[PDB]
């Protein structure tokens with residue numbers, strides 16, 4: 001799996017998880033440190049569904065160029081998993097390239113309030129914790145508030161791949177990240193809903209860092225509870 005060792009700042013690498021399923025990894029520089037951020041790419045026939053930008057116009061343009069070079073299939077739809085700039089930043093680049101950008105109404109409202117880029121299309125049917133909707137080759141799930149009140153997770157049933165965005169932490173992260181917008185009280189319950197819905201998941205992608213198995217869910221609850229206390 002690519003780490004910041006192999007990815008310069010402003011560059012994007014793809015990692016093929018299964019037939020028609022990739023993660024995208026971008027090296028982000030923020031507040032003195034650098035870390036890798038993950039998103040997802042899922043093939044849907046002869047088109048691609050993108051989950052999350054690469055954080056910013058420049059990185060997301062690099063993401064599209066890397067997809068064009070490595071995969072050569074068009075990104076026709078994108079979903080942002082919550083409203084923060086790292087997940088919607090670059091939506092304008094996607095839109096200018098002809099990608100239909102999507103987010104829940106909650107994510108769109110919060111992005112607007114924050115002054116962030118706003119996906120054009122609305123994902124209906126995700127307003128209540130435990131709501132799930134099918135979206136092409138993935139299921140979108142609103143597990144409840146966690147890293148943010150609007151955070152979605154994404155499951156690829158064909159590959160048993162679960163992408164958690166920033167609701168799921170990598171094992172090397174043993175303290176809470178940015179939780180300014182988090183619901184610490186609900187986060188463990190929201191993780192339980194993820195566990196209850198996708199107990200068959202084989203490949204779990206955290207928002208940042210190395211993928212793992214379903215124990216990343218317990219890891220995240222451990223870290224969240226330790227921060228709560």
Ligand SMILES: [Zn+2]
Nearest residue numbers: 082084147166
């Ligand atoms: Zn966030």
Ligand SMILES: [Zn+2]
Nearest residue numbers: 171218219222
């Ligand atoms: Zn752990």
